[PDB]
Design brief:
The structure is cut from a larger assembly and holds six copies of chain A. By secondary structure, chain A is of the alpha+beta class. Helices cover about 20% and strands about 45% of the residues of chain A. The structure holds calcium ion (8 copies). The site of one calcium ion has 4 residues of chain C, from helix 1. It is classed as virus.
Chain lengths: ~120, ~120, ~120, ~120, ~120, ~120
Amino acid sequence: ALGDTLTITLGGSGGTAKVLRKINQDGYTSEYYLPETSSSFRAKVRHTKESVKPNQVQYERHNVEFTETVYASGSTPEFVRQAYVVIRHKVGDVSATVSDLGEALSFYLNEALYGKLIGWES
Amino acid sequence: ALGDTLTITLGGSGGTAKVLRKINQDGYTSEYYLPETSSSFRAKVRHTKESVKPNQVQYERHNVEFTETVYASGSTPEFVRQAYVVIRHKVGDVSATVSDLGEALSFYLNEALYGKLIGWES
Amino acid sequence: ALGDTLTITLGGSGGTAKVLRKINQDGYTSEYYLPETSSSFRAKVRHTKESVKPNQVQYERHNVEFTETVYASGSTPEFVRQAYVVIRHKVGDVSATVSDLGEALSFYLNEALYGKLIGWES
Amino acid sequence: ALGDTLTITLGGSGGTAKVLRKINQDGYTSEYYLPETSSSFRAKVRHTKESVKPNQVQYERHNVEFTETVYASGSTPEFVRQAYVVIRHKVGDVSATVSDLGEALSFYLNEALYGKLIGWES
Amino acid sequence: ALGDTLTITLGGSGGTAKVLRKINQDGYTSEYYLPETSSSFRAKVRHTKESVKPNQVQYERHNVEFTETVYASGSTPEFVRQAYVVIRHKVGDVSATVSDLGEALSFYLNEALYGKLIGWES
Amino acid sequence: ALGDTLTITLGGSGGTAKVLRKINQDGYTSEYYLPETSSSFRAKVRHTKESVKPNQVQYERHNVEFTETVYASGSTPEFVRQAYVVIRHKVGDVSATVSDLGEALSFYLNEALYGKLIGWES
Ligand SMILES: [Ca+2]
Ligand SMILES: [Ca+2]
Ligand SMILES: [Ca+2]
Ligand SMILES: [Ca+2]
Ligand SMILES: [Ca+2]
Ligand SMILES: [Ca+2]
Ligand SMILES: [Ca+2]
Ligand SMILES: [Ca+2]
């Protein structure tokens, strides 16, 4: 599931919604896209399953990545803005529990914080 | 200068705040930690300047990572639960704009979504 | 993000509907298929990004292709019937505008016109 | 035997008519043209007889192509917008039948659909 | 186009339906998955065209596979339960006829039979 | 046990019964057979026990395979129709449980489904 469209709401809740469309899905991956004149938005979902080691816990990775590509204009070359998260847990782990850590992160990361981060505050 | 402690609120704004203590800070990097009875929590905040290459844009990268370490229990080995974010932008980009993309992601990633992700939905 | 099926209405609007089933989608490419007793129908959708070159505009290609395949019948060997379209525009162009040209072509190409084409009327 | 003019109605039926003038016809090929202040329109019709081979069916190609060319404007260089169709069938096939497939495609390709294609929806 | 979900009804038409979600589709292949508390379920549907050899019939092969993964429990390691089918026929065979053989097999394989098989009875 | 004859009921329940006779049993394998003028039917049952690995779960495989061999006639060379299933579980596994997964598969695989499969629907 997840959806046929994916909405990136810039500025968070109540911000500017950008509705991307699913345009491709290969290798446990999805790609949503929304072209515009000045830039384009792309969102990718990826799932991985680290290989089984002889004597080790086997982990799974889930990743979501937002990317705004700003096309080159004038002297200014093309560049990008990008944000993404990764969730990693062992195979049989309790979903609810794992989800809670992700929820904790989303909660932690608000506008105020992002500000400080960009300001190199550790 | 994010503070001496860092609070991880499990399950989102709901509750169960784990207040980690700062335990190290080197190279624009901080680490907080909270050892508990059957698991411990650790948070890392890092800032980086991506390798400058001749003809091309230079990016900065900011990362925040939450980690829960569940100690081994009887026959069950020790394992981890981990979630992290990475914000990447060109040097000199408009921070407010950049912040909006991160804001958009945190907003997008809620309990409902993590549920789906863990289920390998794309 | 096209849909589990794709209908080919032979003879255009009000004609004979042939609803094909999506059987694959990889590399920004779809494939629908409908096998029948005497022939089979197959539709493919392909998206391309033309070779980005130094001082030139970068284009994208969008192609859709219908193909009825009539199986060999006695003396008569197997053969096909194809019809496909290609839309080409530069990255960043205005969708509405581009779409209008495609609409213009679809509109232009009616039964009467196809008749002439098959008749080699140049 | 096509006619002194060819009209490209942008936006399909009821849209903006651009009546091009036939300017050449050689080798089972036509060319219409309509120059304008900011862009020019050009339509071409081509008929081909594919390479006759030993033990194989022989096909014929029929192609029609619309091309708006937007002249350079200040910083903005010159670029085009193309839409073209190709019909392919074996020699001797039943015109009516072949025509039906073309009609099916024209019918299929409407504004809504072009929108999706330009959007890379596969 | 089998659908977004796939239901595995444990114990036959009796009950205990596990509704798996589609999580991937590449190369005429789909994969559904349902992670649960102490085990997870996965289904795969694949289609193949067997390697064409000079003088000889060419076959198509269809496969459906159900898999239950029981996570490790204490000292007991993780293991699997798996059942799958393969239908193989010449290209262009009469599908209805082919279907009848598969139908015959599903019919033959009931609870009573599986019981015997597991007991190594021939 | 299992029987001295094995009945393949084409078209599933209520279909055309073909009663094969056990003609050979070697290596934890059985072979039933029913010759006819135009074709012949063969059913094979096979049991395997994957080798004991140092640190791994040891599995057993049970396989049943139906095969109709259609003798060559005229230009048409001899070809085959074949369907088979495989059940795989660890050695000490609970039979009833395993059986239930097999039952689930047989149940899933009905005429309707086989149709779609042959049609390459994933
Ligand atoms: Ca903001
Ligand atoms: Ca795919
Ligand atoms: Ca929660
Ligand atoms: Ca320090
Ligand atoms: Ca018609
Ligand atoms: Ca329009
Ligand atoms: Ca049962
Ligand atoms: Ca039947």
